[PDB]
Structure formats: C-alpha cells, structure tokens
C-alpha cells in the first residue's frame, strides 16, 4: 500500500 | 565528537 | 570518488535466474534508500524496486512482485537485485539509483534474456 | 505506452529556448508536487537536473528550470547549446511508484 511504499524510500538527512 | 553530532541532528525524510 | 557501480549482467535464458550488484563509494551507503531502475533497449526508464536504508522495508513494482527480490548489506556497502523466473521483456540495462530524487547513477549493466 | 507522456523530439537553434512538456495525471504529476528531470547521453548514466518540480541540484547549470501546471510538467532550457543534445527524462510519484516518460530527445541545429 501507499503507507508501505513511504517507508521503503526512507533516507538518513543530517548534517 | 564530530560523528555523534551528525548522527544526532539526523532525520527521517521520504515522499 | 563518489560513484555507484553495477556487476553481474549478462546473457540469460527465460526462465533462468540472475543477481545483480552494485557497488557504492565515497558516501554514506547506511543512510540512502536505494533504487534499481531499468531500461529497455532504445526505450525510456521503468522503475523496479526500491529498499529503505536499513534495508527493513521494501517495494517492487506490480511487473517483477514476485519475481525480483532486492536487498542490500549496509556493512559490505553494496545493494543486491535477486532476478528469478526471468522474461524476454526483461531484458534491460538496469541502473542503481540513491535516494528518491534519483540524485545518483551508476553506468548500469546489461541483462539479456533469449534462446 | 509510457506512463507520462513526453513530445518524441523537440529541435532548436543554438541560442535558443526549447520547453519541454510532460503531461502526467490527476493521481501523479497533479497530486504530488514531485516531478523530477533527467539527462541522459547515449550509453552513459542518466543525471538529475531538477527534483520538486523546480529545485536545482548544486552542480547544475541555472540554464535549466522546471514548473508545473495542472497534470503537466515542463523543463526549460535557455541558452540551447550543442552539449544539451540529448536524452531527456521526467519522473513524477505515484501511488504504485515513482512514474517516467517515454523520454525527449533534443536536436541542436549547427
């Protein structure tokens, strides 16, 4: 589902 | 040191 | 020496199974979700699969679901495309991309499939 | 077919403004602010030129600007010069996953 597709493209913004 | 503050300011970004 | 570097292509029957790798430099491999996106022979992009930058969750379009498996070792640096059950429509230069603007490439590698 | 919808090819003279269109959807290029662009040359990595319908990555050359109106995308290039022939990309989000178009190929005339 849409919730699902979210978290599979998730990245790590720091610094 | 320099490593722990990036690893502290990070956030989740996605779509 | 920031780059990413696909490996593994080659010719294939259908049917017939394939891995894909891809090597990632001079950057933070742990932090970036991680796409593959492939590309026909004289014809446009088509996105196949994306993992997360922990590798905990990932997403593959409804053309390979079922079929492909992608992965990734975050301490090994490289991300992974399981081919299984594969077409003659799958026969493509695939490309590894960072982050979900797409933001970076590598040169990609050739995946032939026919008898 | 492709899922958005690109002009084949679009030529121009050196010097010049080529606008090229890229007509999506209701549920991808209209709902989402999240229309990327893309060059690519022949047989070498495509390379993103403007992410978020308008915003341009460090490296890229103010040349390029993208904006969106409705269910269509549009990338501008001013300036047309022989090094921007080339393969040109769009990519929008959907709900299924991130959409491309067929591709533009660019002509500069010389």
């Known amino acids: 589902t849409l919730e699902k597709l979210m978290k599979a493209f998730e990245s790590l913004k720091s610094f | 040191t320099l490593e722990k503050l990036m690893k502290a300011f990070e956030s989740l970004k996605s779509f | 020496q920031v780059q990413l570097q696909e490996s593994g292509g080659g010719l294939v029957q259908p049917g017939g199974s394939l891995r894909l790798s891809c090597a990632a430099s001079?950057?933070?491999?742990?932090?970036?979700?991680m796409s593959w996106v492939r590309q026909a022979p004289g014809k446009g992009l088509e996105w196949v699969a994306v993992?997360?930058?922990?590798?905990?969750?990932?997403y593959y379009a409804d053309s390979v679901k079922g079929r492909f498996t992608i992965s990734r070792d975050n301490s090994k640096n490289t991300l992974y495309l399981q081919m299984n059950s594969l077409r003659a429509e799958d026969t493509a230069v695939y490309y590894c991309?960072?982050?979900?603007?797409?933001?970076?490439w590598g040169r990609g590698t050739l995946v032939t499939v026919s008898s | 077919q492709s899922a958005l919808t690109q002009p084949a090819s679009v030529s121009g003279s050196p010097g010049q403004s080529i606008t090229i269109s890229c007509t999506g959807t209701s549920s991808d290029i209209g709902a989402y602010n999240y229309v990327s662009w893309y060059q690519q040359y022949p047989g070498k990595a495509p390379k993103l030129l403007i992410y978020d319908v308008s915003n341009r990555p460090s490296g890229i050359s103010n040349r390029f600007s993208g904006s969106k109106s409705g269910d269509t995308a549009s990338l501008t290039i001013s300036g047309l010069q022989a090094e921007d022939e080339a393969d040109y990309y769009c990519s929008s989000f959907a709900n299924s996953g991130p959409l491309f178009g067929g591709g533009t190929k660019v002509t500069v005339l010389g």
């Open positions: 991309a960072r982050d979900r603007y797409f933001d970076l």
């Open positions: 001079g950057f933070t491999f742990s932090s970036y979700s």
């Open positions: 993992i997360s930058y922990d590798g905990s969750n990932k």
